[PDB]
């Protein structure tokens, strides 16, 4: 039922095994949807949707691809050059995420967060390096050093606050026929692993819904069964979602219960499934 901003972000996952070996994984996402892939071997962007280039011309797309190719190349070489000085022990890993998100009010917020060992390392606020407390002395050292490279900071500032917001608005409009659609879920009931001797687990499966906000609850007519355990909203390959809502009940206190499903695509016709 919960919903946040609509964001476009590029992610990076770099594994530094030894001083001569490093591997980077990168992709481009519009929320949970992958719109970009990166072929690390050829050093090119893979457009996974016909609208993945947004409203950006073939020249501007080839310029950004070149920026990211030089970056992915340079990043592993620069970390391996600076690891000695930063006192890095092999093996270690790095993660990065950068992009921008549209909020209610037309306010687009741009972001860039880095990680070291799955822990926060840095963030970008007002085109500036903000070291994370988790990063330690290493994050403070990283931010104090990266400032000295004005060309890098300028390129990061252009990308985050100029290229991104207009790329986002362009990709949202270019893919509105895919982004702006209603897909109805299907719902079924089953029985789950016994939570005890005189206990039952009633499972309610909800699948094939788009967009992501959903409401699922076990009911006794109109009586909301408060002990309903809500699972995670899991993906389906076909840009739909899966969710299962369970309920632990005594053998007899399950006789008159049902499952009610609320979704934006159902046009007010909630799915109700009686236990039976």
């Amino acid at each position, epitope marked *: 039922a919960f919903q946040g901003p609509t964001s476009f972000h590029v992610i990076q996952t770099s594994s530094f095994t030894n001083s001569t070996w490093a591997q980077t994984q990168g992709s481009g996402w519009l929320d949970d949807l992958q719109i970009h892939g990166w072929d690390s071997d050829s050093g090119t962007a893979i457009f996974l949707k016909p609208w993945s280039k947004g409203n950006f011309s073939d020249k501007e797309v080839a310029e950004l691809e070149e920026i990211f190719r*030089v970056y992915i190349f340079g990043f592993a*070489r*620069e970390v391996q*050059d600076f690891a000695g000085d930063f006192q890095m022990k092999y093996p270690f890993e790095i993660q990065g995420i950068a992009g921008c998100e549209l909020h209610s009010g037309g306010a687009i917020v741009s972001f860039l967060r880095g990680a070291l060992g799955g822990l926060d390392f840095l963030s970008v606020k007002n085109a500036s390096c903000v070291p994370s407390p988790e990063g330690g002395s290493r994050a403070q050292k990283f931010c104090a050093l990266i400032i000295q490279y*004005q*060309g*890098i900071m*300028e*390129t990061v500032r252009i990308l985050l606050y100029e290229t991104c917001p207009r790329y986002l608005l362009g990709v949202l409009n270019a893919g509105k026929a895919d982004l702006q659609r209603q897909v109805k879920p299907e719902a079924w009931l089953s029985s789950g692993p016994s939570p005890g001797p005189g206990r039952l687990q009633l499972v309610c499966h909800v699948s094939g819904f788009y967009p992501k906000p959903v409401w699922v609850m076990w009911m006794r007519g109109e009586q909301e069964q408060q002990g309903t355990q809500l699972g995670d909203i899991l993906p389906n390959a076909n840009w739909t979602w899966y969710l299962r809502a369970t309920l632990d009940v005594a053998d007899g206190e399950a006789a008159g219960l049902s499952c009610r499903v609320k979704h934006s695509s159902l046009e007010g016709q909630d799915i109700i499934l009686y236990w039976r």
Partner: T-cell receptor, first 113, second 115 residues
């Protein structure tokens, strides 16, 4: 859309004269600046460089300060030697050296004894 | 011994083919092929950002390149023309923020294409 603009043509100077080879550039960003020297019958070689604005390159009596405001990298020497007879190329590349270098046409220096 | 070039000098008939070899045992990632003519200055033909990768420069027509091994940058002339009469210089560099990323040039190769 980078460019390098250096001194128009050949420059003849007597031994121990003050040398000035003007160089200005046009670039977007924070590029690095270089001076390459090409001796007769030889290839080009770095004379000096200044990786960031206000840096000062110094080699073989020659010097050049990277002035971002006047978008310049003027070459200077207090007392030119006869061995300074060469072509001087002003150069530019984005910082990091991950992209191509932009050279000026080169200035010929003739130090007469 | 830094950047070396073979041949040092060559005279070709129009239509004849040749290969210029450039080698560097400095472990440099980048390699470049230029030609130098009076009044024109240095003009890039082709360049390589790493072993297996090549790209076109300012004056690439009439020339082909290859980077099979990181050490060498091969420049080819498939059909020599009199316009290809020039002094050819190879350069190599090592990118990196702390690297001494200047270009290192070879001695030159004089080529003359006669009818």
């Amino acid at each position: 859309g980078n460019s390098v603009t250096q001194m128009e043509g050949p420059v003849t100077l007597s031994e121990e004269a003050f040398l000035t080879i003007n160089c200005t550039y046009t670039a977007t960003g924070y590029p690095s600046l270089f001076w390459y020297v090409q001796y007769p019958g030889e290839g080009l070689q770095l004379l000096l460089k200044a990786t960031k604005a206000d840096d000062k390159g110094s080699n073989k009596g020659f010097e050049a300060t990277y002035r971002k405001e006047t978008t310049s990298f003027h070459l200077e020497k207090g007392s030119v030697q006869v061995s300074d007879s060469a072509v001087y190329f002003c150069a530019l590349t984005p910082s990091g050296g991950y992209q191509k270098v932009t050279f000026g046409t080169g200035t010929k220096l003739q130090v007469i004894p | 011994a830094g950047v070396t070039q073979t041949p040092k000098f060559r005279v070709l008939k129009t239509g004849q083919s040749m290969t210029l070899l450039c080698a560097q045992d400095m472990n440099h990632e980048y390699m470049y092929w230029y030609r130098q003519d009076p009044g024109m200055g240095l003009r890039l033909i082709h360049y390589s950002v790493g072993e297996g990768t090549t790209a076109k420069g300012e004056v690439p027509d009439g020339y082909n390149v290859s980077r099979l091994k990181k050490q060498n940058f091969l420049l080819g002339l498939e059909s020599a023309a009199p316009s290809q009469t020039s002094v050819y210089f190879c350069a190599s560099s090592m990118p990196g923020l702390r690297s001494s990323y200047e270009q290192y040039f070879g001695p030159g190769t004089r080529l003359t294409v006669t009818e």
